[PDB]
Structures are given as structure tokens and as C-alpha cells.
Amino acid sequence: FPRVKNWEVGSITYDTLSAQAQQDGPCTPRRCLGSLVFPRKLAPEQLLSQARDFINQYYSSIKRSGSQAHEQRLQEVEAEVAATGTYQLRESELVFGAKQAWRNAPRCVGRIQWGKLQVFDARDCRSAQEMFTYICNHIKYATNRGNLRSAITVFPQRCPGRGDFRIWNSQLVRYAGYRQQDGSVRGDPANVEITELCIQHGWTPGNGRFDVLPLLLQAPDEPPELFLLPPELVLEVPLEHPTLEWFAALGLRWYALPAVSNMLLEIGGLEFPAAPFSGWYMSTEIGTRNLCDPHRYNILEDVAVCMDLDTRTTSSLWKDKAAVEINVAVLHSYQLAKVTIVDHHAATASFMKHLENEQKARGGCPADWAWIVPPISGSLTPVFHQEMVNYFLSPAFRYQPDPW
Amino acid sequence: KFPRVKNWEVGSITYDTLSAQAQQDGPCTPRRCLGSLVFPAPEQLLSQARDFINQYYSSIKRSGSQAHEQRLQEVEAEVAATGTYQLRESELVFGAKQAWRNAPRCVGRIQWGKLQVFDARDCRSAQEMFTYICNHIKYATNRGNLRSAITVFPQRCPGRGDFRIWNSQLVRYAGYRQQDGSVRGDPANVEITELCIQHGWTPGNGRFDVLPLLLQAPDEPPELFLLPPELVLEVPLEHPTLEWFAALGLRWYALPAVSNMLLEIGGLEFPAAPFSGWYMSTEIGTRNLCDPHRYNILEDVAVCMDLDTRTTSSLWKDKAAVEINVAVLHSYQLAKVTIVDHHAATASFMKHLENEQKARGGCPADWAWIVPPISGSLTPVFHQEMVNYFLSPAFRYQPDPW
Numbered sequence A: 001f002p003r004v005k006n007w008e009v010g011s012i013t014y015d016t017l018s019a020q021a022q023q024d025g026p027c028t029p030r031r032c033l034g035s036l037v038f039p040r041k042l043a044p045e046q047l048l049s050q051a052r053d054f055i056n057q058y059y060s061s062i063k064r065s066g067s068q069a070h071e072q073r074l075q076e077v078e079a080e081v082a083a084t085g086t087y088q089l090r091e092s093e094l095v096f097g098a099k100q101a102w103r104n105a106p107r108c109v110g111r112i113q114w115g116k117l118q119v120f121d122a123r124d125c126r127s128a129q130e131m132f133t134y135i136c137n138h139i140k141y142a143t144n145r146g147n148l149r150s151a152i153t154v155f156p157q158r159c160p161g162r163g164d165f166r167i168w169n170s171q172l173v174r175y176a177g178y179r180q181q182d183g184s185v186r187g188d189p190a191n192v193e194i195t196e197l198c199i200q201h202g203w204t205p206g207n208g209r210f211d212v213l214p215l216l217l218q219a220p221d222e223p224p225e226l227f228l229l230p231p232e233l234v235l236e237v238p239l240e241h242p243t244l245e246w247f248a249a250l251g252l253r254w255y256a257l258p259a260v261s262n263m264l265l266e267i268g269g270l271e272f273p274a275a276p277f278s279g280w281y282m283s284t285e286i287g288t289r290n291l292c293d294p295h296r297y298n299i300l301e302d303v304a305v306c307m308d309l310d311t312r313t314t315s316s317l318w319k320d321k322a323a324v325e326i327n328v329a330v331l332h333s334y335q336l337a338k339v340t341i342v343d344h345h346a347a348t349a350s351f352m353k354h355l356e357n358e359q360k361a362r363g364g365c366p367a368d369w370a371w372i373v374p375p376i377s378g379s380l381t382p383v384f385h386q387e388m389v390n391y392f393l394s395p396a397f398r399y400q401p402d403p404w
Numbered sequence B: 001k002f003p004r005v006k007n008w009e010v011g012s013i014t015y016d017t018l019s020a021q022a023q024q025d026g027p028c029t030p031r032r033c034l035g036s037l038v039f040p041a042p043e044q045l046l047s048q049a050r051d052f053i054n055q056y057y058s059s060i061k062r063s064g065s066q067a068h069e070q071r072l073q074e075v076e077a078e079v080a081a082t083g084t085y086q087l088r089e090s091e092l093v094f095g096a097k098q099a100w101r102n103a104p105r106c107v108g109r110i111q112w113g114k115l116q117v118f119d120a121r122d123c124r125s126a127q128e129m130f131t132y133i134c135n136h137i138k139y140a141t142n143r144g145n146l147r148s149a150i151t152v153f154p155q156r157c158p159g160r161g162d163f164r165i166w167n168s169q170l171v172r173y174a175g176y177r178q179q180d181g182s183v184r185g186d187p188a189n190v191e192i193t194e195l196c197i198q199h200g201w202t203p204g205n206g207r208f209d210v211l212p213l214l215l216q217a218p219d220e221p222p223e224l225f226l227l228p229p230e231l232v233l234e235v236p237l238e239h240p241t242l243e244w245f246a247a248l249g250l251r252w253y254a255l256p257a258v259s260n261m262l263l264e265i266g267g268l269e270f271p272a273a274p275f276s277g278w279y280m281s282t283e284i285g286t287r288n289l290c291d292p293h294r295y296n297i298l299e300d301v302a303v304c305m306d307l308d309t310r311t312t313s314s315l316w317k318d319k320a321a322v323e324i325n326v327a328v329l330h331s332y333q334l335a336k337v338t339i340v341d342h343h344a345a346t347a348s349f350m351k352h353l354e355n356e357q358k359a360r361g362g363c364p365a366d367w368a369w370i371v372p373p374i375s376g377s378l379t380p381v382f383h384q385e386m387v388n389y390f391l392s393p394a395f396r397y398q399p400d401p402w
């Protein structure tokens, strides 16, 4: 039972929940691998025991264990797998398992919200044009004209036999990235690969820096085909600064809805290779990482030139000064546009309350310190001073090979 | 099977074969990572010794030579006869450099071979100790042009007690509790302040009162020693444009000299071996002044800046903090005292990582400690994956001797 301390206040708690971790992680007594983005590398017999454990926490959370109403559910599952080698989830179980995978996501800082999630059950899906209609229902419901609502849409699980449903884009909204005789990039360098797949699959390229990409959707066994998102379903936010009037002229935008569509939803031993979820942005994700990472839009020196900062010497902290204004512009622009967003202070403070909540509820919370701490002003937030334990619980969102 | 490590800013990939020989074990398991925690007889002393000697004779390009097998047999025979052994001076110098080189939370390690080693292993009393320490401080400070130094005091030995310095650093500011239950000065130092008082220190009542030294000679209670005002170079803090900032009366000192860590070399243990470098400006500006449980000036500066502190989305904290860091860097450069900002520091740590991979095939690095406390992803170490593990020689933490 690891001892975890908060250095700002002095409180101590013990993490008893860690003892129930099973899926072993990357670290050993010899060496710590906590900072690696993708840890390690990306006869059903074992399918039963995973299913059993999940059902036991489902009925643990709700009502009753012991001559209850779920040895019946225990029996139906093992009879289901005995018959067909896989089983189906009750809609409330899929709902509960969806909420738990969010609750167990060590790298997510917004888990104080894990109880409010809209689980669309898309398991009766049959083709790409139908998928695309689920994805569009989600996007409309999530966006909600800027009053954002957490939502996940679960497509049919992996079933031994033939291929699985697959969103080829990493998100539902991604900006194109084009190359030159420079080898430089116009638009988002994170999306240089998928941009040329859309092109090689028929899409006509675009103007440049903020072209929303088409959707590459894949039904089982079929080759993927492109889908164009309706420009009215893709709410974007022009970036302007409250007092730097020239900032709007830089032409920067970002989209409203963060919707990750490449991760794998594992519930009770079932694998859902297509289960896109969405929430709302923390502001530093846009202002600091997306716009200012050297391998992303890399705008930092451009904004410092415009602010007339001393870029000739690092010790003027021009990088720090321009990055703060970029973030102030993000927060300002989303609020003026009435689009849900949350700044890294509000968010980290909420996550501390989540930690105390989870301490009383489950005796701990898995948290990945390096991803909980924001990428600007780390030690200014309380999460910086909070020791944390990182470990894998199921249900879980997990990374997966991309379909190439 | 060696960990694969990527730099995401550039696309680089390397493999950390050096982690494979990590001689001590940490707190992480495959069940759970604890990287974020702050505080994670005969031939076992001989095995660390043989390894260290193997290290030394490898760096002087003389591995497996005449002089090498002799030293092994010397050290072995000495542990049989005395239970311990004595480092030669050249070994001590190399051992102290490796300890810095091996320190996984140090972003200043590009400098690790530029290290001035003072051998005080002949020290006899707390009074001699004091004299050696004033010499260390005088040499490291060097009128504001700081130099890396370490003074090594006698090793832990059977039959005698330890030398210990009770202060966590050579230069620290008093922390007095008070009427409000509040602390005046540095809250991180209330306990050592209470120990100095009850050992005969006449306490002041300011916010930046330099503490006396509590020095322990073996099997003796600690003795108080005052540092001469002129040995402790301080820096008044002002801001290059916010002229009201100098009216906060804030100061910091020049020399960061950590005195409470244990130096370990080939199984031998030195519980007293203070070491000093020069500050990175975030240690002072961000942590020491803005930590809510340290001086905690952030709101008072943000109010003085006429920022809107009612709402977090104005980012008033980030803005006040960045100007505090500016003021720290300005003030140190104005006073001609060495200082490094977190952009220069992290860029040189990247160069250190590239040197280390070519030399030893890797580098122990604690990401959460290497990444600065403000502007993290603005620096290149953010996008560098790292491998944390414990190599000897090393500095370790040790319990407080009270």
C-alpha cells in the first residue's frame, strides 16, 4: 500500500486501489519508464475471467452481491461464451463500463466529470455510411452549439472472424498538413500522414493551414472510403486577443470539440476498436501544445516578434511571455464564442477534488503525474505538489496499432 | 532488451543500454509506477569497491592492468584487516564527479567534469570543519563568478560517529513561527531554526535572516557557528520595468550549497560532503518565492501588477510568476552573480544527453525533475523521453541527525 504525500499541505494517504492493478506496466525495480508516451509496444479461455471481474464490479457498484440478480448474469455470460466464444454487454453495463474506462484513464485530468457521460450504443452498425451517421450524431450532440457535453459512441466490438470497424483519423476533427519543395509544412504537422491518405483516397487538397480533413471510415473487411464533414457540424473558433489587436490578423483558429477516434475501449474482455469519445478542451492543449510545440504549428516566435519582445536572448523569457498571451487568447476567444473550455488552473483544482473523492470511494486513483501536470505553469497548480501512483485498471481506454 | 527512448520534437530514437547495469533498485514495479515520489558486512562492501575500482581504472584507460589488479588486491586485503578501506585522492576526485554525473534529478550535469574537490578527510573537530566550509563558500562564490565545488569530510567508519552538517544548505533563511500561527521568513526552515535557537542562537525577526551552522563532530552534540556577513553574497531583487518591485524587500543568496546529502563511493559512505553550483532561476523565482508553502508572494505580486485575481482564466498567476522570474534573472545579472535560465539550462542538458549516449550509451534522468516548473513544454526536455535509474557513485538522501 504505497504512501502518497501532498507537499503543499502535508497530508498523507495510502493507495489501496493499486493492489488491484493487474495489467502490468513498463516500470521495474531497475529503471523507471514513466515518461514514455507509448509504454512498451502497442482459445479465448481468458475472455471469461475478464468478463467475470467486470460483472462483479458492475453489481458491486449498483445494488447487491449474493443470491442477487447476477449469478443469472454470471451464468448467461459463461453460457454465452460457451455457445459462441464471445458475449454481448447489457446496455447499462456498456454504459457503466464506458464510465469506468474514463474514470480509470491515468492521464486524464478532467475525470471529476466521469459520472456525466452520454453513451450512444452504435453496436448495431453495419457499414461506413451508417458509421458516418453515428459520428455526425455524436458531433452534433457533443458540440451542442458550443455548450459541450461529454459523449462516447460505441461501435460493434471485435469479433473473431473478420475485420473490425476503424476510424482512420486520430480525431474526428484534424487540420490538414501539406509539404513543399522546402519539405516544410502548411497546416498541422501532426497530420501530415493522414492528409496524404485522404488525398490518395480521392480527396482534393486544400488552401492551407486550417483545412478540416475528411473522415476515413472503415467497415469490416471493406477498404476505407472518405466522408466530408458538413461545415456547419464543425464549430471552429477564430483566435483573437483581448488587448493585442493584431493577434486576430495572424489568422489563427482552432476547433471546438476534442474527439479522439483512434483508441480502443476494453470492457470485460471485449475490445471496441472504434469507440470515439469527446469532452471539452483544457486551454493549454490548444495554446501551448497544438499552437506552440516546435513540431506542431510552432507559432511562438511569430507571436513574440509581433509583441516586439527581445528574442535575441533566452533570459528575457520571451518564449514564456508570448506563450502566456497565446493562452490568454485561447481562453478569451472560446469564451467570446460561447464554447465550453477550462483553463489549466480550474482543471487541476478540480482534479484534486476528484482525488479526495476517489480516495473515499475506492481508496485511490491512478494518475500519471507527467500528464496531469499542465505544460505551462506546472508548479503553480496543486497537482505539481501531489505525489501520484500510476497503474492499469480495467475497463480502460488503450492505444492500438493504427490500420496500416 | 533495452528501453527504447524517443525525442518527440525531432523524431530521434535511442536505446538506453546503460540502465542495464543499474546497480540499485527503485520503488517502481510492473504493477505501479512511483516515479513521482520525492523520497523513493564484508564482501558486499567489497563488491561495490571492486565495481568502483573497475570504473576508475576504466576512465584512466588502464583497465585490467598491473596497477589495477594490485589495487583490487589492496582493497580486498584492507577490508579483511580493517573492515573498511581508504580511497586514494585521485579516486576521490573521480568518485565525486561520477556522483554528480549520475545524479538523475540534476539538469546542470553538462558541467559534471568541471568540479573542484576539496579533500577534508583529515578534519578533526567541528571547528576545523567550520574553517573548511568558509573556504568552500569563499571559493565557490568567487565574488559572484561562481565555481562548482564539493568539500569531502571524513568517511563513516566503525567505532566513531558521523560528521554531520545539520543545515540542509550552507546558506538558508530563518523561518520563525509567530502569533498568527504564520511563519515569518522561509517556512521550509522552521525546524532547523528551532534547533539553532535552542542550541544558543539569538534569533532575529526579519524574512531573510541567514541561519547559523549546526556542525556535528563525531560523538559530539552539534555546535553553533555564525557565518561572517561578508562571506554570504546576497542579491537584492528588482524588476527591470516594474519599479515598485524593489519595494518588496525581497533578496536571495548567490550560492546554492546542499549540505545534508550523503556521498557514496565504492561502498564507502560520506555523510558530510556539501556541494555547490549556481542557481537556475526557476528554483528561486518559481519554487522558492511562489510555492504556496514557501514565501508565497504570487498573489501579492499579481495584485501589484493590477492583474484580475478574481478569476483564474485571466492567467494572472502565470503572468505574475513570469515577471518574478524576469526580476530574478535581471537582479542576478545586475549584481554580476552567475545564474542560468531554464531555457539555456535545458538546452545544455540535451547536449549532456547526447554526450552521455555516445560515452556510456545512456543517462539516468528523472523527467519530472528535469522539466522546469514553469514553461515546461516550451523547453526541449519536455519532449524527450527519459529512463530513471540509480547508478553508484551517488548522492543519496539521509535522515535528519536529530
Ligand code: HEM
Pocket (backbone or CB within 6 Å): A098, A102, A105, A107, A108, A109, A110, A111, A113, A117, A150, A151, A152, A277, A278, A279, A280, A281, A282, A285, A342, A347, A371, A397
Ligand atoms: C470533460 C472534459 C475533459 C477534459 C478537460 C479532458 C482533458 C484531458 C487532457 C488534458 C488529457 C491529456 C491528453 C494529452 O495532452 O495527451 C486527457 C487525456 C485523456 N482523456 Fe480526458 N478530458 C475530458 C474528457 C474525457 C472523456 C469524456 C473521456 C472518455 C470518455 C476522456 C478520456 C481520456 C483518456 C483515455 C485520456 C488519455 C489519452 C491517452 O492516453 O492518449 N477524457 N484528457
Ligand code: HEM
Pocket (backbone or CB within 6 Å): B096, B099, B100, B103, B105, B106, B107, B108, B109, B111, B115, B148, B149, B150, B275, B276, B277, B278, B279, B280, B283, B287, B340, B345, B369, B395
Ligand atoms: C553548476 C550548476 C548546477 C545547476 C544549474 C544545477 C541544477 C539543478 C537543479 C535545478 C536541480 C533540481 C532542484 C530541485 O529539486 O528543485 C538539481 C539537483 C541536484 N543536483 Fe544539480 N545543479 C548544479 C550543480 C550541481 C553540483 C556541483 C552537484 C554535485 C557535485 C549537483 C548535484 C545535484 C543533486 C544530487 C541533485 C538532486 C538534489 C536532490 O536530490 O534533492 N548539482 N541541480
Ligand SMILES: Cc1cc(N)nc2cc(-c3cncc(CN)c3)ccc12
Pocket (backbone or CB within 6 Å): A258, A259, A260, A277, A278, A279, A280, A281, A282, A285
Ligand atoms: C476526451 C479528451 C478531452 C480533452 N480535452 N483532451 C483529450 C486529449 C486526448 C489525447 C490523447 N492522446 C494524445 C493527445 C495529443 N497529444 C490527446 C484524448 C482525449 C481528450
Ligand SMILES: Cc1cc(N)nc2cc(-c3cncc(CN)c3)ccc12
Pocket (backbone or CB within 6 Å): B108, B256, B257, B258, B275, B276, B277, B278, B279, B280, B283
Ligand atoms: C548543487 C545545486 C545547484 C542548483 N542550482 N540547485 C540545486 C538544488 C538542489 C536541491 C536539493 N534538494 C531539494 C531541492 C529543491 N526541491 C533542491 C541541490 C543542489 C543544487
Ligand SMILES: Cc1cc(N)nc2cc(-c3cncc(CN)c3)ccc12
Pocket (backbone or CB within 6 Å): A007, A008, A369, A384, A385, A386, A387, B036, B037, B038, B291, B368, B369, B370
Ligand atoms: C512530483 C514532483 C516533481 C518535481 N520535479 N518536483 C517535486 C518537488 C516536490 C517537493 C519536494 N520537496 C519539497 C517540496 C515543497 N514544495 C516539494 C514534490 C513533488 C515534485
Ligand SMILES: C[C@H](O)[C@H](O)[C@H]1CNc2nc(N)[nH]c(=O)c2N1
Pocket (backbone or CB within 6 Å): A034, A035, A036, A037, A370, A371, A372, B008, B382, B383, B384, B385, B386
Ligand atoms: C516525453 C514526455 O513523456 C511526453 O512529451 C509527454 C509528457 N507529458 C504530456 N502530457 C500531456 N498532457 N500530453 C502530452 O502529449 C505529454 N507528452
Ligand SMILES: [Cl-]
Pocket (backbone or CB within 6 Å): A258, A285, A290
Ligand atoms: Cl488536440
Ligand SMILES: [Cl-]
Pocket (backbone or CB within 6 Å): B256, B283, B288
Ligand atoms: Cl534553494
Ligand SMILES: [Gd]
Pocket (backbone or CB within 6 Å): B241, B242, B243
Ligand atoms: Gd515601469
Ligand SMILES: [Zn+2]
Pocket (backbone or CB within 6 Å): A027, A028, A031, A032, A033, A034, B028, B029, B032, B033, B034, B035
Ligand atoms: Zn515508474
